[PDB]
């Protein structure tokens, strides 16, 4: 049971970090690798981006890249954080798993593939909203 | 999102708007109202353990049929939304989920 | 076989009116997912 236990402070205010939590229990952390996952009421879905091994934090071109992603070992937290929120980001944040899926299409030996990063277990989700109220 | 009506007890065909240029990878989630999603079937055949065989996949004949979501026997748990997700050759790195597939089934029991 | 080229080339499409500017672009997304496969859109003079 990996219950990606998020807990954020649920008020903020703009241009400040929002700090939700990602708990990994029931298993192990550094076996299968572990991501993010955002939507909003009215809109989509959207994804914040990728941590993996080697922690380089990619990052999503349509957010400006305002975000600030990471995660640390210690308290078998993800860490993900928002540097100067605007008030357009008032939805819900949620925690995401990935499967670095190896998609075949070609000849290995040319770089004639590439990688699907698919995703299967899911959190549930804090919303905060972001104003002059915090 | 876009509104659709079917009837009960009958095999139903999702289609999401975006064509599939180049080999696809499509993924399926179930976005219940309210509450968090799960997924249907990825690899485009490979459904996930506990998942009922009334979700079935569509297969690649290389072109041809679009990314088809195969659901035969909707019943009182399927009132939802769905998603298509789906990676080819020519968008690159699919970075965006894609539009928003509704359904809403009439004749409900 | 020169000759024999040279002969059945001869009565084919003349390609002169081709040098033309052509206003060409990268097809690929991601890198190197194939150059080697250059977009050019140019003009052409047609039957008119
Ligand atoms: C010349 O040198 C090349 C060097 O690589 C030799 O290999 C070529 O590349 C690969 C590897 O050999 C092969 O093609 C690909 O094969 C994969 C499947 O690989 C599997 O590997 C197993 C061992 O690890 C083996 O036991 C299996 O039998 C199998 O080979 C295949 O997935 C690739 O194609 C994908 O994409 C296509 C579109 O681009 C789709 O049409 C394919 O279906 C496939 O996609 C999946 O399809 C599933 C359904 O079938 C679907 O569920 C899923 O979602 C995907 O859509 C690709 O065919 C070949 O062996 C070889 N390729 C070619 C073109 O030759 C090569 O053999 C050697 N000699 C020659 C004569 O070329
Ligand atoms: C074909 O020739 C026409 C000649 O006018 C080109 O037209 C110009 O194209 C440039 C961009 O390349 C524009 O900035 C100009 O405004 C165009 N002029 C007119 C009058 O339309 C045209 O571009 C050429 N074909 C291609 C593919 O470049
Ligand atoms: C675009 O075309 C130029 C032509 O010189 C090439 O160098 C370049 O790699 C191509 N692709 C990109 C991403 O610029």
């Known amino acids: 049971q990996v219950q990606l236990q998020e807990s954020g402070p649920g008020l903020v205010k703009p241009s400040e970090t929002l700090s939700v939590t990602c708990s990994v229990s029931?298993?192990?952390?550094?076996?299968?690798?572990w991501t993010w996952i955002r939507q909003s009421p009215g809109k989509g879905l959207e994804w914040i981006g990728y941590?993996?091994?080697?922690?380089?934090?990619t990052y999503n071109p349509s957010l400006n890249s305002r975000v600030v992603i990471s995660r640390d070992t210690s308290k078998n937290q993800l860490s993900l954080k928002l540097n100067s929120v605007t008030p357009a980001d008032t939805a819900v944040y949620y925690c995401?798993?990935?499967?670095?899926?190896?998609?075949?299409?070609?000849?290995?030996?040319?770089?004639?593939?590439?990688?699907?990063?698919?995703?299967?277990?899911w959190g549930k989700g804090t919303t905060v909203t972001v104003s002059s109220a915090s | 999102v876009r509104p659709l009506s079917v009837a009960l007890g009958e095999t139903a065909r999702i289609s999401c708007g975006r064509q599939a240029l180049g080999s696809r990878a499509v993924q399926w989630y179930q976005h219940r109202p309210g509450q968090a999603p799960i997924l249907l079937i990825y690899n485009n055949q490979d459904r996930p353990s506990g998942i009922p065989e009334r979700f079935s996949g569509t297969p690649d004949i290389n072109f041809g049929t679009r990314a088809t979501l195969t659901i035969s026997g909707v019943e009182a748990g399927d009132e939802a939304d769905y998603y298509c997700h789906m990676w080819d050759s020519r968008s690159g790195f699919s970075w965006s989920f894609g539009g928003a597939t509704r359904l809403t089934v009439l004749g409900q029991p | 076989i020169i000759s024999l080229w040279d002969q059945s080339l001869k009565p084919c499409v003349k390609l002169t009116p081709l040098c033309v500017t052509l206003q060409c672009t990268n097809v690929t997304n991601n890198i190197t997912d194939d150059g080697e496969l250059k977009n050019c859109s140019f003009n052409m003079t047609t039957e008119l």
């Open positions: 995401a798993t990935a499967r670095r899926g190896q998609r075949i299409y070609g000849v290995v030996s040319f770089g004639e593939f590439f990688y699907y990063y698919s995703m299967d277990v």
């Open positions: 029931g298993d192990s952390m550094n076996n299968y690798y």
């Open positions: 941590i993996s091994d080697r922690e380089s934090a």
